[PDB]
């Protein structure tokens, strides 16, 4: 498997979408998002898409700073 790359933030009026590469070939993805001191929250579980809507997580506190991570899983 290969790690996702080119993670990009796409956000307008807070509708926030994380996008990445590349198209999944025999592997799925799962995204996790967190605030500097908060726990990691999982989203878009084992999706085959190359984007993930994180809107519902960032609108909890628009002034916070978030970090996301894209995991690659085989199969």
């Amino acid at each position: 498997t290969v790690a996702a790359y080119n993670l990009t933030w796409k956000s307008t009026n807070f509708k926030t979408i994380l996008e990445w590469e590349p198209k999944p070939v025999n592997q799925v993805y799962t995204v996790q998002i967190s605030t500097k001191s908060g726990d990691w929250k999982s989203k878009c579980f084992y999706t085959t898409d190359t984007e993930c809507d994180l809107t519902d997580e960032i609108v909890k506190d628009v002034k916070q700073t978030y970090l996301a991570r894209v995991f690659s899983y085989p199969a």
Binding site: T12, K15, I17, S42, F45, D53, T55
Partner: protein, 142 residues
């Protein structure tokens, strides 16, 4: 749009562009300023990406430049509100709402369990102590 005998009609942005559909020259051709023309042409010729009604499950679309934004109903999320939040009750998702242990079951609802010393409540997700001193609890604070 122009079809001889509507040419006689004097310039009209309303007519013109709103009205019928116009060309850049035609906006030219009304605004004069370059500047001013592009300003108008920026949105006018960008198209309504919402025409394809991309927002699903009762979502609302809001056009943008070369894109759109979907406002989803509470039980949905995703670029196009395609994601059903109700279909996400799995253990990897915040432990499946389980207080202690979570067990996934394809074809059926996930199930919650508890550590020795505790028992599952009727709410199907909470664990309560079955002994005086269960593990993982601090007496002097309880």
């Amino acid at each position: 749009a122009n079809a001889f005998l509507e040419e006689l009609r004097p310039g009209s942005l309303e007519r013109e562009c709103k009205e019928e559909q116009c060309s850049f020259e035609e906006a030219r051709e009304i605004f004069k300023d370059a500047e001013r023309t592009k300003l108008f042409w920026i949105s006018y010729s960008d198209g309504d990406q919402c025409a394809s009604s991309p927002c699903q499950n009762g979502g609302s679309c809001k056009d943008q430049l070369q894109s759109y934004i979907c406002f989803c109903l509470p039980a949905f999320e995703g670029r196009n509100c395609e994601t059903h939040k109700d279909d996400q009750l799995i253990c990897v998702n915040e432990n499946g709402g389980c207080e202690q242990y979570c067990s996934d079951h394809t074809g059926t609802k996930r199930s919650c369990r508890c550590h020795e010393g505790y028992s599952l409540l009727a709410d199907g997700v909470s664990c309560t102590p079955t002994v005086e001193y269960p593990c993982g609890k601090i007496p002097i604070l309880e």
